[PDB]
Amino acid sequence: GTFLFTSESVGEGHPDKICDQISDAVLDAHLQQDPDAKVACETVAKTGMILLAGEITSRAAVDYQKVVREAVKHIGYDDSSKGFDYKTCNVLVALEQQSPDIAQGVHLDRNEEDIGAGDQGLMFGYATDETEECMPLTIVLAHKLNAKLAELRRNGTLPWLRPDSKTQVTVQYMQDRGAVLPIRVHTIVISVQHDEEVCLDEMRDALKEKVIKAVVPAKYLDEDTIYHLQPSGRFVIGGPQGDAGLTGRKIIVDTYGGWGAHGGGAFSGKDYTKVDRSAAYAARWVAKSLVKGGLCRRVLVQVSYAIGVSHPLSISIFHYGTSQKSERELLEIVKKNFDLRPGVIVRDLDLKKPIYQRTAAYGHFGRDSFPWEVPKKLKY
Amino acid sequence: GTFLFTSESVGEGHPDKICDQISDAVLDAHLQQDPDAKVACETVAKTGMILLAGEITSRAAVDYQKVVREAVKHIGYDDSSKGFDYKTCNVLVALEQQSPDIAQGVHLDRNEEDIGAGDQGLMFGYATDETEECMPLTIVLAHKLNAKLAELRRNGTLPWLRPDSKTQVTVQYMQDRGAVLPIRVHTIVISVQHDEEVCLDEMRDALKEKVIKAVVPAKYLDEDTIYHLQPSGRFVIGGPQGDAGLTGRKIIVDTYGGWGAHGGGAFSGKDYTKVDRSAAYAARWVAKSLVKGGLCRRVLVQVSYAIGVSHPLSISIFHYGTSQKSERELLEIVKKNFDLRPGVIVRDLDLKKPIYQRTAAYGHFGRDSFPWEVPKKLKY
Ligand SMILES: CSC[C@H]1O[C@@H](n2cnc3c(N)ncnc32)[C@H](O)[C@@H]1O
Ligand SMILES: CSC[C@H]1O[C@@H](n2cnc3c(N)ncnc32)[C@H](O)[C@@H]1O
Ligand SMILES: [K+]
Ligand SMILES: [K+]
Ligand SMILES: [Mg+2]
Ligand SMILES: [Mg+2]
Ligand SMILES: [Mg+2]
Ligand SMILES: [Mg+2]
Ligand code: NA
Ligand code: NA
Ligand code: NA
Ligand code: NA
Ligand code: NA
Ligand code: NA
Ligand code: NA
Ligand code: NA
């Protein structure tokens, strides 16, 4: 009756995550000056290079060199010995205005509440009662392992650490009337970029004792747990030098770690009219409201849109058998309690606020009591 | 007892798909000369620009200018009036060798069958008996609508069409003991780039009569079906000029349209040692083998890897209640019939063959009897 499930996470210096953070730093910089900025900022990173490409129409005056370099500094890439340096890297900008054909079809001359979706697409939200924050344990643990690495790097206790890391956690679960119950951790992987001087045994010992044991409750770890710590054997070259990064290439890390579902759309670098982000945040909010409201133990919500059309084209609720109410009844409750037009979501979730860089590492969900993490009290 | 489900697809000239196709054209060009090429080629597209960034170690001599421009020509961007021209665009190359630290940990001095996974990660395969090709009807129809647009563009019957398109299909389904049964098409969206001269009513009439009715069986369409055809009202600016493209930003279009699950890893631009692609293809092969073998009607397969380790860390089977056998029994059948090491998958699925550009539009699954689409006869 048990099964395995695996999720991964990556650190702040993973090259794809660097791009997500830079894209959201650019978004935040625009929103600080122009709350109605239209932003679709993609970032690419390779050895010595950050390239910004995409479309921004905004009244803000943004110094892209400063914004990009400050984001890279925060991540920790500050010296050529680490493979990347905010002070001396190339920052290239290929940003144009938003297409006028898009603007006229989406938002020009429209009442804000009745703004059209900025694109077509589908989005999902998910929630599970297996943790208090209503997220899968596999990804929660994977994120926390990367956060612990960054903490021990920044506090100097493991000074050989560099910012690029990846983690992966496999949990054995049992099923319980459609809900899932974590039993034990089956396998953990950690790979992290390191300096030239530290040896492999020192790193493997530290990763077990100072990282894993600091993060994962002992009750989940036993004599059979498998550890793959620095499994490649050597990871000195890292960051964009080791692997090109792009915005929107960590969409499963950003969401539910393989649980639930995903509609395909990236979050970072996008203002609220891009429903890939706003409607996925709203769908999370719905899912978490249903679980915290006691209606379900686990739930998946789908929504979809057409460019230029305000109301969603479809809404669907899947409760895995974890409610006494039918999925049709839950759908009716959702329709009575939520208005999923983007021009209403923006108000409910405060999506003109420049908090997006905070979302761009360690997952967008299950953390920090963002508005989409505060359950709505449901009337039914 | 019914529910809605929505999936989308995009055309060959959608800027993200342009990038996937170019990345796979580069991969194929290397494999034609060096079957053991190590390729991790990302492409970015914006107005007037294709940038290649990533890591390739290969004995091939590849003319990137020619390979990129020939791919763009095939897609149909051949004139400045269309917003992009293979003859005159900028092609920039930022390609380096594969990191030596990766190479030593993955494949150097290893027997091919015992090559390590080229990265950690998780991957899923899915199959559903709702269509003969074992794919969800929503995405099959969405892909076919884009293919029809390209056909009518290329044969000159709708000469106002340009290559950038998106489609979205919402189907009403019923549930049947864990399997799903399509009932009707609830909503269709089509947006496609067009010339300056054609008017909106002409386009909407053609999209209904010459595209939708040519693709979607009439039995699924009724008086209540909702059509959003050119919903933005104007789409003259398109391709990379309208929206930046990047490789690996259509991973749900490339797979199951929101059904099943996704592990997050992109396919295009990657050789077989990158398990994001090879293990997802193998997982599809497993799933389709279970459904075509009569063991399940619908199934989701998860696998995961650690960099440098050959055997998967975890394998999981979820049959939605559509088998008389338990998921544990199915897992045992899978373990007895499949060897999911990358250095074995490469042999079973012929993954050194330069056929990858053919996979990079209209989905990687459900088409053309690729090796992962030919079911394995199972012994149990
Ligand atoms: C294998 S390339 C994909 C990711 O794996 C990590 N990586 C890079 N080099 C190594 C290495 N030598 N060993 C382990 N992981 C690595 C980086 O996070 C990179 O973005
Ligand atoms: C809205 S930007 C995302 C995608 O939508 C499409 N698109 C671009 N411009 C328009 C438009 N004016 N109307 C409808 N869809 C568009 C392109 O396929 C683009 O890559
Ligand atoms: K990459
Ligand atoms: K884009
Ligand atoms: Mg990546
Ligand atoms: Mg999208
Ligand atoms: Mg895109
Ligand atoms: Mg990956
Ligand atoms: Na503005
Ligand atoms: Na899942
Ligand atoms: Na989304
Ligand atoms: Na709230
Ligand atoms: Na080679
Ligand atoms: Na799904
Ligand atoms: Na994958
Ligand atoms: Na085969």
Q: Convert B91-126 to b/e letters by CB count within 10 Å (16 or more is b).
A: beebbeebbebbbebbbeeeeeeebbbbbbbbbbbb
Residues on chain B touching A229 (C-beta within 8 angstroms): none
Q: Per 3-state DSSP, what percentage of chain A is helix, strand, and coil (rounded to 5)?
A: 35, 25, 40
**A228 with A293, same domain?**
no
- Residue B276 annotated as catalytic: yes
Whether B161 maps to a domain, the answer reads yes
Q: Indicate which atom in ligand 1 lies nearest the CA of residue A243.
A: 20
Q: Which residue blocks in chain A are alpha helix, DSSP H?
A: 15-33, 64-75, 100-106, 137-154, 200-206, 213-215, 275-292, 327-337, 342-349
Strands B49-57 and B38-46: antiparallel
Q: Helix, strand or coil for residue B78? A: strand
- Residue B14 annotated as catalytic: yes
Q: What is the Cα Rg of chain A in Å?
A: 21
**A145 with A227, same domain?**
yes
What dihedral do alpha carbons A286, A290, A292, A294 form, nearest 10°? 170
Whether A245 maps to a domain, the answer reads no
For the beta sheet containing B226-229, the strands, ordered from the edge strand earlier in sequence to the opposite edge, are B2-10, B161-176, B179-194, B226-229
Domain closes at, from A62, A77, A111:
A111
* Rounded Cα distance, B242 and B261, in Å: 30
For residue B289, what are its two tokens? 């083998």
* Rounded Cα distance, B342 and A252, in Å: 22
DSSP letter at B363 equals -
* Rounded Cα distance, B141 and B151, in Å: 15
Whether B105 maps to a domain, the answer reads no
**A125 with A268, same domain?**
yes
Q: Which residue blocks in B34-183 are alpha helix, DSSP H?
A: 64-75, 100-106, 137-154
Handedness of CA A119, A121, A122, A123 (dihedral sign): negative
- The distance of Cα B76 from the centroid of its chain, to the nearest Å, equals 20
Phi and psi at residue A91, in whole multiples of 5°?
Answer: -120, 115
Angle made by CA atoms B71, B146, B284, in degrees to the nearest 5: 80
Q: How many other C-beta atoms lie within 10 A of the C-beta of residue B132?
A: 9
* Rounded Cα distance, B378 and A192, in Å: 40
Cβ–Cβ of B241/A100 closer than 8 Å?
no
Residue B372 CA, ligand 16 centroid: distance in Å? 5
What dihedral do alpha carbons A321, A322, A326, A327 form, nearest 10°? -80
Ligand 1 pocket test: pick from B99, B120, B122 the residue with the most ligand atoms within 8 Å of its Cβ: B99
Q: B339 and B331 in contact (C-beta within 8 Å)?
A: no
Whether A243 maps to a domain, the answer reads no
For residue B43, what are its two tokens? 């492409």
What's the domain count of chain A?
A: 3
* Rounded Cα distance, A186 and A227, in Å: 9
Q: How many CA atoms lie within 13 A of A58 on its CB side?
A: 26
Q: A327 and A351 in contact (C-beta within 8 Å)?
A: no
* Rounded Cα distance, B45 and B86, in Å: 12
Q: A18 and A263 in contact (C-beta within 8 Å)?
A: no
* Rounded Cα distance, A56 and A224, in Å: 52
Q: A311 and A291 in contact (C-beta within 8 Å)?
A: no
State which residues form the domain around A318.
121-129+253-373
Per-residue 3-state assignment (H helix, E strand, C coil) for A249-318: CCCCCCCCCCCCCCCCCCCCCECCCCHHHHHHHHHHHHHHHHHHCCCCCEEEEEEEECECCCCCCEEEEE
For residue A318, what are its two tokens? 């899947």
Cβ–Cβ of B105/A232 closer than 8 Å?
yes
Find, among B142, B21, B7, B5, the residue nearest to B76 by Cα: B21
Cβ–Cβ of B314/A5 closer than 8 Å?
yes
> CA dist B233 to A193, A300, B229, Å?
50, 33, 9
Domain closes at, from A205, A238, A271:
A238
Q: How far is B338 from chain A (nearest CA, A)?
A: 18
> What is the greatest pairwise CA distance in chain A?
65
Residue B327 CA, ligand 13 centroid: distance in Å? 41
Q: Helix, strand or coil for residue A210? A: helix
Cβ–Cβ of B232/A94 closer than 8 Å?
no
Query: What lines the ligand 1 site, CB under 6 Å?
Result: A 14-15, 164, 166, 191, 232, 234-235, 238, 242-243; B 99, 101-102, 105, 119, 307
Q: What residue type is assigned to position B168 of the chain? A: Q
Q: Helix, strand or coil for residue A91? A: strand
Q: How far is B154 from chain A (nearest CA, A)?
A: 24
**A227 with A258, same domain?**
no
**A361 with A289, same domain?**
yes
Find, among A189, A198, A191, the residue nearest to A159 by Cα: A198
Whether B331 maps to a domain, the answer reads no
Residue with tokens 């951790």: A185
Q: How many other C-beta atoms lie within 10 A of the C-beta of residue B223?
A: 4
Give the closest ligand to the alpha carbon of residue A348: 12
Residue A122 CA, ligand 14 centroid: distance in Å? 11
Residues on chain B touching A249 (C-beta within 8 angstroms): 246, 248-249, 264, 266
Find, among B358, B357, B354, the residue nearest to B369 by Cα: B358
Whether B278 maps to a domain, the answer reads no
Whether A116 maps to a domain, the answer reads no
Ligand 1 pocket test: pick from A46, A75, A196, A235 the residue with the most ligand atoms within 8 Å of its Cβ: A235
Residues on chain B touching A233 (C-beta within 8 angstroms): 104-105, 308
Q: Which residue blocks in B58-135 are alpha helix, DSSP H?
A: 64-75, 100-106
Whether B256 maps to a domain, the answer reads no
Which residue ranges of A are tagged as binding site for Mg(2+)?
A: 16
Please provide the DSSP assignment of A138-166 as one string.
HHHHHHHHHHHHHHHHHTTSSTTEEEEEE
Cβ–Cβ of B253/A259 closer than 8 Å?
no
DSSP letter at B46 equals E
CATH of the domain at B206: 3.30.300.10
Angle made by CA atoms B162, B167, B171, in degrees to the nearest 5: 160
**A162 with A305, same domain?**
no
Q: A19 and A43 in contact (C-beta within 8 Å)?
A: yes
